[PDB]
């Protein structure tokens, strides 16, 4: 199999097909934000602190560049390691303290990696 790229990935995911897909993206350690009234410190700002709703836009430029504008800054999104083993995204909901539910949400096929565009952050200031 030829090594695909994120631009072609999303382009065929939306233009060639309309079927939904489950993705597994690795975000940077700290997001470019502040814990909103989380009782603090410049500590880590992860997805656990952010609220629902639109948090950023995904830009697909010419020549295959794939960026993630998460506010003032823009990260870049690339392909992760091409996994070939089975990866099942499931929901383990302990509705009761004695009995819980495992809900197989779907299958994971491709992995994304998001990294800060350090060159832009450096030439910026």
């Amino acid at each position: 199999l030829p090594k695909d790229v994120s631009v072609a990935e999303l382009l065929r995911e939306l233009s060639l097909t309309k079927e939904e897909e489950l993705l597994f993206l690795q975000l940077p350690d700290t997001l470019p934000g502040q814990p909103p009234t989380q009782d603090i410190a410049e500590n880590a700002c992860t997805l656990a602190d952010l609220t629902e709703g639109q948090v950023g836009k995904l830009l697909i430029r010419k020549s295959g560049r794939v960026q993630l504008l998460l506010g003032k800054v823009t990260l870049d999104v690339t392909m992760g390691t091409a996994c070939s083993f089975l990866q099942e995204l499931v929901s383990v909901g302990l509705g009761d303290s004695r009995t819980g539910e495992m809900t197989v949400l779907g299958h994971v096929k491709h992995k994304l990696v998001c990294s800060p565009d350090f060159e832009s952050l450096l030439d910026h200031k």
Binding site: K3, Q26, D29, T81, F118
Partner: protein, 739 residues
């Protein structure tokens, strides 16, 4: 003396005895102070280094410490309690000579041009030579005596050094360690370390067809035995375990636990297991197996003489090890004295201050520096010839001896390879300067423009690598290691993770290092054959400054050099403005360097600052050395180490065992820029003679030369030889004395 000693004391801050608990001795802060002499009766006095030279005493400073302890369950504290003496390196931070003017140097009877950097013990000047040794915690693929291509890694932590090997003696891989009675199959070890499925092991080794073909016999040998669970492999290893001479204390016929402890701690120490989770160690041994398999085909056997794998230990690291050993011995002696005294004596409560002998540390330091033999039982290190007598034949002699490097192998035998001049010595070590004789190639000299890195904190490197998209190794199976585009990223021998598109990672890391968020001595290199990105941050690596070239134009311009000449900026300003950067040997393996501007092409990443910095200090004396044959340059380096001439401005007050002076020294007419840099012309070691090249009288047949009688009568070549005759008049134990 400013950082490391405090770290050592913090590591051993509290000492207590098992007998009589609630008794302790706690160290608070440690000081070395200024050099002093104990001649005055219970009084110190500031002493110049020349005074220590004349009196045949040591130039040392008092090691004091402030402590808190318990005499009778009442806490008693001392704010300044001497415990030892540090021999003080000349021109160091605590040396009296530092920050002094030439007039003040004359008042102290010390030559302003003296290089310093040497200890004075019992009146003699000792220099701790820079040691060279192979880097630790690195996979080395090498052929054996029988031609079998095996692997070795010397996993060394702060506590234990253990070299574990992997052999292919019968087409299958065995792991050999000093703690195992017999080498055991690698698949059994894999099963013992948590991963039990054979398919997972094969995925970790590699998915190339020839890899499976090579690794099949090991799987068959494992399947011949009934080892299929972690417990069975642990039992097998415990059977293959040997007791350390009846280790006192038995925790229930230990065996499986012994095997698991050896796997977790003793085998591959540098690879850490978080809490008995051998995933990282499994990945490391799988990578080692894969490298052995790949090297078993095309004979890409790594060479030991490559200086990217070499590390230099200076005086600081050696003194740190020695002081750690001595302080541990001192604390052990104190604890033993406490055990012997406290539980039996009297209501007169035992206190350490009456027993803290101060000659332990001082005698250890003095003996180790003077004799030069270092015996560290805590490290099982028996080194000899660490220190050497500083040679005062000439100024060049001392200066060139000050920059020497000794090899880990000795002229004890006819070795081949280290003795050779490897191309890796470029810019780092002088090619011409080597002792002509039995030690040819085993004693080397640093180049004029070189730097030895120290240790870094290693934290921000990990943080940046994690933030740069390096996937965690535990998150994926070993099959990803066999992909053509997946690159492993290491860090000081530890697998930091995996990455795709390593070009972006390397460029970002270099850009961050140039920006200043990463220490400028952190090196990053890429090995495309093994597909491994190495990040080196340990100390002892050789580095050299190079001018950064971006798109066929150097970052350094004429205006920058004009500012440097005018004093607007210094070299550190060049470092911070991304104009000049340090290159390590491993890093410069991946860079493209242009010797001159006209050599710069499209694919040039760095520019040579000055080619003549390739030569060392002694080789700098040679005028037009590029017009000669290399053996002549080596002979001249040796000869000029022995050249007669002035030593320093205080050569008259100095009393040495043997001194050679020239009556009328003259500075050379053809002087290298290296001569100007080292101020050799201030202390010349020769005379200019009107030489006529011709054959005369047949008295100059083989290397002989004819001298003019009138020239010698007029002072040419006139020399002075100073010898020393010393006597001692000592008072004996009986109150009778030499008279």
């Amino acid at each position: 003396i400013n950082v490391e000693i405090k770290k050592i004391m913090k590591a051993n801050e509290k000492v207590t005895s098992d007998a009589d608990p609630m008794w302790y001795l706690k160290y608070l802060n440690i000081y070395v102070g200024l050099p002093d002499v104990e001649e005055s009766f219970n009084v110190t006095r500031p002493v110049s280094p020349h005074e220590c030279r004349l009196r045949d005493m040591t130039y040392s400073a008092p090691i004091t410490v402030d402590i808190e302890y318990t005499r009778g369950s009442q806490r008693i504290i001392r704010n300044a309690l001497p415990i030892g003496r540090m021999p003080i390196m000349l021109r160091s931070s605590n040396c009296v000579l530092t920050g002094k003017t030439p007039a003040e140097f004359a008042k102290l009877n010390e030559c302003p041009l003296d290089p310093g950097g040497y200890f004075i013990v019992k009146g003699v000047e000792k220099v701790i030579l820079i040691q060279e040794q192979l880097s630790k915690n690195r996979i080395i693929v090498e052929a054996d005596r029988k031609g079998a291509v095996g692997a070795s890694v010397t996993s060394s932590t702060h506590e234990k050094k253990s070299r574990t090997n992997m052999a292919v003696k019968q087409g299958r891989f065995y792991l050999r360690h000093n703690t195992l009675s017999e080498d055991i199959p690698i698949v059994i070890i894999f099963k013992a370390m948590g991963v039990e499925s054979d398919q997972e092991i094969v995925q970790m080794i590699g998915t190339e067809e020839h890899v499976m073909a090579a690794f099949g016999p090991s799987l068959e040998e494992c399947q011949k035995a009934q080892i299929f669970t972690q417990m069975q492999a642990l039992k097998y290893i415990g059977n293959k375990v040997r007791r350390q001479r009846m280790w006192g204390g038995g925790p229930k016929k230990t065996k499986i636990e012994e095997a698991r402890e050896l796997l977790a701690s003793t085998i591959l120490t540098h690879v850490p297991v978080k809490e008995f989770n051998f995933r990282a160690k499994c990945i490391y041994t799988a990578v080692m197996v894969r490298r052995v398999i790949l090297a078993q085909g095309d004979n890409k056997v790594d060479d030991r003489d490559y200086y990217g794998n070499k590390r230099l230990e200076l005086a600081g690291q050696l003194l740190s090890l020695l002081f750690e050993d001595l302080f541990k011995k001192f604390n052990s002696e104190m604890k033993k004295i406490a055990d012997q005294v406290i539980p039996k004596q009297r209501a007169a409560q035992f206190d350490v201050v009456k027993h803290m002998r101060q000659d332990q540390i001082t005698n250890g330091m003095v003996n180790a520096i003077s004799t030069g033999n270092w015996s560290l039982k805590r490290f099982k290190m028996d080194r000899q010839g660490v220190t050497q007598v500083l040679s005062r034949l000439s100024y060049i002699s001392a200066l060139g001896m000050m920059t020497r490097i000794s090899s880990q192998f000795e002229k004890t035998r006819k070795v081949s390879g280290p003795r050779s001049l490897q191309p890796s010595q470029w810019g780092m070590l002088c090619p011409s300067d080597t002792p002509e004789g039995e030690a040819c190639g085993l004693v080397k000299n640093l180049a004029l423009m070189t730097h030895i890195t120290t240790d870094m904190e290693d934290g921000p490197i990990v943080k940046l690598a994690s933030n740069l998209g390096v996937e965690d190794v535990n998150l994926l199976c070993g099959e990803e290691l066999s992909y053509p585009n997946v690159f492993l990223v290491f860090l000081n021998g530890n697998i930091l993770g995996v990455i795709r598109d390593h070009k972006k990672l390397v460029n970002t890391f270099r850009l961050m290092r140039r920006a200043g968020y990463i220490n400028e001595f952190v090196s990053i290199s890429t090995n495309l054959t093994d597909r491994c990105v190495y990040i080196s941050s340990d100390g002892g690596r050789l580095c050299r400054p190079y001018i950064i070239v971006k798109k066929q134009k150097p970052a350094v311009t004429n205006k920058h050099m004009e500012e440097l000449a005018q004093g607007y900026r210094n070299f550190e300003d060049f470092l911070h403005e991304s104009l000049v950067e340090y290159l390590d040997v491993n890093e410069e393996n991946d860079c493209n360097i242009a010797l001159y501007e006209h050599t710069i092409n499209k694919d040039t990443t760095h520019l040579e600052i000055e080619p003549f910095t390739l030569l060392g200090v002694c080789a700098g004396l040679i005028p037009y050395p590029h017009h000669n044959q290399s053996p002549r340059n080596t002979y001249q380096c040796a000869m000029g180490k022995q050249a007669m001439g002035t030593i320093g401005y205080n050569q008259r007050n100095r009393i040495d065992t043997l001194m050679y002076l020239l009556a009328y020294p003259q500075k050379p007419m053809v002087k290298t820029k290296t001569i100007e840099l080292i101020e050799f012309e201030k202390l010349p070691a020769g005379q200019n003679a009107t030489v006529a090249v011709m054959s005369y009288s047949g008295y100059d047949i083989e290397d002989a030369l004819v001298l003019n009688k009138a020239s010698l009568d007029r002072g040419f070549g006139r020399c002075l030889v100073y010898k020393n005759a010393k006597c001692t008049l000592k008072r004996y134990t009986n109150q009778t004395f030499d008279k």
